[PDB]
Design an enzyme around this catalytic site. Structure first.
Site, PDB file in Angstrom:
ATOM      1  N   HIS C  74      43.578  61.713  15.411  1.00 16.05           N
ATOM      2  CA  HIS C  74      44.917  61.114  15.499  1.00 16.05           C
ATOM      3  C   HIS C  74      45.178  60.507  16.852  1.00 16.05           C
ATOM      4  O   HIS C  74      46.128  60.873  17.548  1.00 16.05           O
ATOM      5  CB  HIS C  74      45.993  62.132  15.134  1.00 16.05           C
ATOM      6  CG  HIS C  74      46.047  62.455  13.661  1.00 16.05           C
ATOM      7  ND1 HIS C  74      45.433  63.528  13.132  1.00 16.05           N
ATOM      8  CD2 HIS C  74      46.667  61.796  12.605  1.00 16.05           C
ATOM      9  CE1 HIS C  74      45.650  63.563  11.805  1.00 16.05           C
ATOM     10  NE2 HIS C  74      46.409  62.501  11.482  1.00 16.05           N
ATOM     11  N   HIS C  78      42.856  55.309  15.895  1.00 15.08           N
ATOM     12  CA  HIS C  78      43.450  55.448  14.564  1.00 15.08           C
ATOM     13  C   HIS C  78      44.651  54.555  14.378  1.00 15.08           C
ATOM     14  O   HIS C  78      44.818  53.955  13.318  1.00 15.08           O
ATOM     15  CB  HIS C  78      43.802  56.911  14.299  1.00 15.08           C
ATOM     16  CG  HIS C  78      44.572  57.144  13.018  1.00 15.08           C
ATOM     17  ND1 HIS C  78      44.044  56.925  11.801  1.00 15.08           N
ATOM     18  CD2 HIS C  78      45.869  57.605  12.805  1.00 15.08           C
ATOM     19  CE1 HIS C  78      44.955  57.225  10.855  1.00 15.08           C
ATOM     20  NE2 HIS C  78      46.072  57.639  11.469  1.00 15.08           N
ATOM     21  N   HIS C 112      52.866  54.900  14.370  1.00 12.64           N
ATOM     22  CA  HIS C 112      53.079  55.893  13.305  1.00 12.64           C
ATOM     23  C   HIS C 112      52.606  57.297  13.592  1.00 12.64           C
ATOM     24  O   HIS C 112      53.059  58.229  12.935  1.00 12.64           O
ATOM     25  CB  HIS C 112      52.492  55.407  11.970  1.00 12.64           C
ATOM     26  CG  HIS C 112      51.049  55.794  11.765  1.00 12.64           C
ATOM     27  ND1 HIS C 112      50.029  55.108  12.313  1.00 12.64           N
ATOM     28  CD2 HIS C 112      50.478  56.853  11.060  1.00 12.64           C
ATOM     29  CE1 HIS C 112      48.863  55.689  11.974  1.00 12.64           C
ATOM     30  NE2 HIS C 112      49.137  56.758  11.209  1.00 12.64           N
ATOM     31  N   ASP C 113      51.690  57.460  14.548  1.00  8.11           N
ATOM     32  CA  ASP C 113      51.198  58.789  14.945  1.00  8.11           C
ATOM     33  C   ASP C 113      51.428  59.123  16.427  1.00  8.11           C
ATOM     34  O   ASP C 113      50.740  59.985  16.984  1.00  8.11           O
ATOM     35  CB  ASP C 113      49.708  58.946  14.603  1.00  8.11           C
ATOM     36  CG  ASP C 113      49.475  59.481  13.198  1.00  8.11           C
ATOM     37  OD1 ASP C 113      50.311  60.254  12.693  1.00  8.11           O
ATOM     38  OD2 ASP C 113      48.437  59.142  12.601  1.00  8.11           O
ATOM     39  N   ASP C 223      47.073  54.369   6.135  1.00  6.86           N
ATOM     40  CA  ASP C 223      46.859  55.633   6.841  1.00  6.86           C
ATOM     41  C   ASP C 223      45.531  56.291   6.455  1.00  6.86           C
ATOM     42  O   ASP C 223      44.853  56.880   7.299  1.00  6.86           O
ATOM     43  CB  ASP C 223      48.018  56.599   6.570  1.00  6.86           C
ATOM     44  CG  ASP C 223      48.115  57.716   7.601  1.00  6.86           C
ATOM     45  OD1 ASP C 223      47.525  57.594   8.692  1.00  6.86           O
ATOM     46  OD2 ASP C 223      48.794  58.723   7.321  1.00  6.86           O
ATOM     47  N   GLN C 275      35.684  66.854  -0.427  1.00  3.63           N
ATOM     48  CA  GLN C 275      35.806  65.398  -0.400  1.00  3.63           C
ATOM     49  C   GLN C 275      35.950  64.826  -1.809  1.00  3.63           C
ATOM     50  O   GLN C 275      36.794  63.962  -2.044  1.00  3.63           O
ATOM     51  CB  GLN C 275      34.620  64.761   0.334  1.00  3.63           C
ATOM     52  CG  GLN C 275      34.717  64.869   1.849  1.00  3.63           C
ATOM     53  CD  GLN C 275      35.909  64.116   2.406  1.00  3.63           C
ATOM     54  OE1 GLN C 275      35.933  62.886   2.412  1.00  3.63           O
ATOM     55  NE2 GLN C 275      36.911  64.852   2.873  1.00  3.63           N
TER      56      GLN C 275
HETATM   57  C1  LIG Z   1      38.432  61.701   4.363  1.00  4.20           C
HETATM   58  O1  LIG Z   1      39.009  62.964   4.004  1.00  4.20           O
HETATM   59  C2  LIG Z   1      40.279  63.168   4.269  1.00  4.20           C
HETATM   60  C3  LIG Z   1      41.057  62.262   4.934  1.00  4.20           C
HETATM   61  C4  LIG Z   1      42.371  62.563   5.210  1.00  4.20           C
HETATM   62  N1  LIG Z   1      43.133  61.703   5.858  1.00  4.20           N
HETATM   63  N2  LIG Z   1      44.283  61.960   6.097  1.00  4.20           N
HETATM   64  C5  LIG Z   1      44.863  63.073   5.752  1.00  4.20           C
HETATM   65  C6  LIG Z   1      44.155  64.078   5.159  1.00  4.20           C
HETATM   66  C7  LIG Z   1      44.767  65.224   4.724  1.00  4.20           C
HETATM   67  C8  LIG Z   1      45.591  65.886   5.556  1.00  4.20           C
HETATM   68  N3  LIG Z   1      46.186  66.979   5.224  1.00  4.20           N
HETATM   69  C9  LIG Z   1      46.266  67.380   3.989  1.00  4.20           C
HETATM   70  N4  LIG Z   1      46.967  68.532   3.713  1.00  4.20           N
HETATM   71  C10 LIG Z   1      47.960  69.037   4.615  1.00  4.20           C
HETATM   72  C11 LIG Z   1      48.737  70.222   4.059  1.00  4.20           C
HETATM   73  C12 LIG Z   1      47.818  71.288   3.480  1.00  4.20           C
HETATM   74  C13 LIG Z   1      48.607  72.559   3.129  1.00  4.20           C
HETATM   75  C14 LIG Z   1      49.953  72.229   2.546  1.00  4.20           C
HETATM   76  C15 LIG Z   1      47.908  73.473   2.177  1.00  4.20           C
HETATM   77  O2  LIG Z   1      48.899  73.176   4.360  1.00  4.20           O
HETATM   78  C16 LIG Z   1      47.220  70.584   2.310  1.00  4.20           C
HETATM   79  C17 LIG Z   1      46.333  69.475   2.827  1.00  4.20           C
HETATM   80  C18 LIG Z   1      45.572  66.681   3.044  1.00  4.20           C
HETATM   81  C19 LIG Z   1      45.594  67.113   1.589  1.00  4.20           C
HETATM   82  C20 LIG Z   1      44.864  65.571   3.416  1.00  4.20           C
HETATM   83  C21 LIG Z   1      42.911  63.731   4.751  1.00  4.20           C
HETATM   84  C22 LIG Z   1      42.108  64.668   4.154  1.00  4.20           C
HETATM   85  C23 LIG Z   1      40.802  64.369   3.886  1.00  4.20           C
HETATM   86  O3  LIG Z   1      39.994  65.220   3.267  1.00  4.20           O
HETATM   87  C24 LIG Z   1      40.690  66.343   2.694  1.00  4.20           C
HETATM   88 ZN   LIG Z   2      48.003  58.454  10.707  1.00  3.19          ZN
HETATM   89 ZN   LIG Z   3      50.635  60.996  10.690  1.00  3.16          ZN
END
Ligand SMILES: COc1cc2nncc(-c3cnc(N4CCC(C(C)(C)O)CC4)c(C)c3)c2cc1OC
Ligand SMILES: [Zn+2]
Ligand SMILES: [Zn+2]
Ligand SMILES: COc1cc2nncc(-c3cnc(N4CCC(C(C)(C)O)CC4)c(C)c3)c2cc1OC
Ligand SMILES: COc1cc2nncc(-c3cnc(N4CCC(C(C)(C)O)CC4)c(C)c3)c2cc1OC
Ligand SMILES: [Zn+2]
Ligand SMILES: [Zn+2]
Ligand SMILES: [Zn+2]
Ligand SMILES: [Zn+2]
Lengths: 318, 318, 318
Positions: C74, C78, C112-113, C223, C275
């Site tokens: 981040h 990015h 945004h970040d 994003d 993934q």
């Molecule tokens: C390329 O792979 C990803 C890229 C990504 N790019 N941006 C964001 C994420 C990502 C960021 N965070 C995520 N969360 C946050 C909350 C989390 C809980 C709520 C369980 O704490 C669930 C997963 C999720 C589902 C995805 C993300 C996740 C990725 O793999 C899981």
């Molecule tokens: Zn971002």
């Molecule tokens: Zn963000």
């Protein structure tokens, strides 16, 4: 007046931090910009809201921060963590210490590793570092104290300016002795002396030389407090500690000197046994003796024993 | 006067450093703030205490430092290390070089990788970097020299201000040629030419074009000097070199171009063989030819041969 | 005048970048000092050379850069990468958006970040961070917008100063909504609503609330755009993303809370399956819905599908 406005102020942390900061095994978290507030909170509760002028204290803290280096373990986070352990000891032994001692010890803890490069006294000696020529014993620790005094001498940085000269000289002595005591080479003789005095009943906190020794052991206990946290914290901190050891080991090899296994990155498999040896020879006796002298510090010993059990579990492959 | 006070001064390093700095395989250590003093010491012994005004030299050194980046290998440490190798060559061939050449070459070595990003000329070309459009050949090296001149043009930074214009132009030419010679692509043709001239006996250090070639080879020898250190240093430095190669390899893959095995982090197992190939094709011939031309540089060749034996030991799994 | 001189200027990138910047899967490269020029180029082509005063825009960009942290993913890179994806969407849907929307969305993407520590909203809540007390929902995203406004309020930083108050308020609303939409927790409800409106034919870009939703999905698509690059870029970026997840996982363990497998560094073997789950549940539906609404964004979906095939290849051990 300024001291009057400060007397009416109340510094607060978030709800979870207020509760858990009182616990010996508290972790200060990964948010660096919250650490100064955490330290100020600890000072306010242990010493009082009128011990330091707030503006001066904040200036002092930021200058101290600026003089810690970006090394794996002997960094700004370590300084605040050691200060927290001292806070918990002070709070649980609150009737024992003077106003000056409480001021001094928290400041000493924050300043105790100032300008640390991540190398031991032994390496500096072998590299023939200018510091080793100036300080033949406790090389880094003597430097840490010198850095402390240099920061205090900066304009608007003397947090003890309201003290009389007599009190100023006393607190600086408290700070000097406490910082020098963090030389682990001096710990072994100190603990042994304290154990003998405890068993015979000669140990007297009203005797200044005895008192200095006990404070010295408190400083060791705070310095080593990574082994008194909960297992996940203890295990992760060990990564940072060994990162520095291996870097020193690399540098030893560059001097043409084979380092001890503790500092050799080719012998990573020996770490669990090395940890067992460290707890048995250093950590367990430290907290055992401290608990004998100061029974409320018991949770440190219990947590150290629990981490010992965890390392034994690693050795067995469990 | 100022030059008079400087004539009476004596700059000294710690005892171990004074002794071991004369050795070709000397390592400058992990204490960054000692490197400027080490460089100044080398300048004072090789050129003299009156070659540079001390205040100007220190200002220059700190500005040079500020213009090296935080990359694994092509950093401030590399600059001072290359400068040390040149110091040792100069000291062991002391009757050969003029005052201007000694000044120029140590400064050239310190400045030779200024503003390096950790990428080769090839990558910059393929990425279509603005620098590649400006410098079609020796892209980075032409940039290093341009950075050098920019630093010299800063207020209070012209360390050659006491020179006549004639001498100033001569030393800047020495510096330009020396820095351009560190383009390893130019080394192969240079060494081959020098070998032929050595064998026929046409090689004459009184001929300026011959002299430039020999200096060029000295620059290669200093640039590559990681292979002339003792094994523990040589092995650890290789980690830093390949860290940069793998990063470039990653970036090559991002452009949609398969990088050469040397830069591919998926082919780490090929490194020992790659090292064998590098010593055979590049390092050994470099120091062999240099030793022929300048016999006192022999220790560089011996150490290179010893490291070759060590890599062969790795290949066999021993 | 100043606006007249700017109207005659033409900002150009190197030949390769000019061509490949138009591609959805473009990578901005490892040369940090080229990123500001890349952003300015994108603004000039999508909005116009008279949308912003150049000196103000450059000042704004450098301040934004200064307020991104040195975290694995981040970070400043990015921000510019997300801005590029928005540029490509805007350029391929050029008749759809107003002048204000084009200005706002590129700026929103860059901002945004802002001031991201590399931790999710969930961690901040559990750590009881001051920000979580101030913003109960979309904690970090509300902070990102607050940082944006603070930068705009700095002297010489209001890049929208030529706008009327009415237009200024409109662009700030565009920016606020766009930044809040990058809270992935809000994406699931948004995509579901958009899918229903698309199928029934109620979806109308002339309806402001519908328009806000579509922009919200565009923001998610930009994003997440790491999954829309070519495989070598997609795989390498995943390393940075998981570096942050594992660090959060470590911190979760320090709080005494077992993190989800995605954030647990002891479960690295589960990543390929994780993934697969992410593409199926999040990425594929995002780009599928976006392609339905905006057919020229098709290349994002195709590249996402190709990366899905690659992860399946990893799972099989191929
Ligand atoms: C390329 O792979 C990803 C890229 C990504 N790019 N941006 C964001 C994420 C990502 C960021 N965070 C995520 N969360 C946050 C909350 C989390 C809980 C709520 C369980 O704490 C669930 C997963 C999720 C589902 C995805 C993300 C996740 C990725 O793999 C899981
Ligand atoms: Zn971002
Ligand atoms: Zn963000
Ligand atoms: C959690 O584990 C440790 C924490 C630690 N925290 N602080 C300090 C150390 C540590 C630091 N250095 C130590 N020395 C320094 C001198 C060294 C000699 C004298 C052989 O050079 C012996 C070991 C020792 C014994 C311990 C220490 C060592 C640890 O494991 C061995
Ligand atoms: C200790 O090992 C090395 C030290 C080194 N020190 N300095 C420079 C290099 C090195 C740097 N780059 C090299 N190139 C660059 C161009 C590259 C092509 C032209 C194929 O792009 C061929 C290899 C080569 C052959 C060597 C070098 C390479 C080494 O191993 C291969
Ligand atoms: Zn210490
Ligand atoms: Zn310490
Ligand atoms: Zn170079
Ligand atoms: Zn070099």
């Amino acid at each position: 007046t300024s001291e009057e406005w400060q007397g009416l102020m109340q510094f607060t942390l978030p709800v979870r931090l207020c509760k858990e900061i009182e616990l010996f095994h508290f972790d200060i978290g990964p948010f660096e910009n919250m650490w100064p507030g955490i330290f100020v909170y600890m000072v306010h509760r242990s010493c009082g809201t009128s011990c330091f002028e707030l503006e001066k204290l904040c200036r002092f803290i930021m200058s101290v921060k600026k003089n810690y280096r970006r090394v794996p373990y002997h960094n700004w986070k370590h300084a605040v963590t050691v200060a927290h352990c001292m806070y918990a000891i002070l709070q649980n032994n609150h009737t024992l210490f003077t106003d000056l001692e409480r001021k001094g010890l928290l400041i000493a803890c924050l300043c105790h590793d100032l300008d640390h490069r991540g190398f031991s006294n032994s390496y500096l000696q072998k590299f023939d570092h200018p510091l080793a020529a100036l300080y033949s014993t406790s090389t880094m620790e003597q430097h840490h104290f010198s850095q402390t005094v240099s920061i205090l001498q900066l304009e608007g940085h003397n947090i003890f300016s309201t003290l009389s000269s007599s009190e100023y000289e006393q607190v600086l002595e408290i700070i000097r002795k406490a910082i020098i005591a963090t030389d682990l080479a001096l710990y072994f003789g100190n603990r042994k002396q304290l154990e003998e005095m405890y068993q015979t009943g000669s140990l007297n906190l009203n005797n200044q030389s005895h008192r200095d020794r006990v404070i010295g052991l408190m400083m060791t206990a705070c310095d080593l407090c990574s082994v008194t946290k909960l297992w996940p914290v203890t295990k992760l901190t060990a990564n940072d500690i060994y990162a520095e050891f291996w870097a020193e080991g690399d540098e030893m090899k560059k001097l043409g000197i084979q380092p001890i296994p503790m500092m050799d990155r080719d012998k990573k498999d020996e770490v669990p046994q090395g940890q067992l040896g460290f707890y048995n020879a250093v950590a367990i006796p430290c907290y055992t003796t401290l608990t004998q002298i100061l029974p409320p510090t018991e949770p440190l010993l219990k947590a150290c024993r629990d981490n010992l059990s965890q390392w034994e579990k690693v050795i067995r492959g469990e």
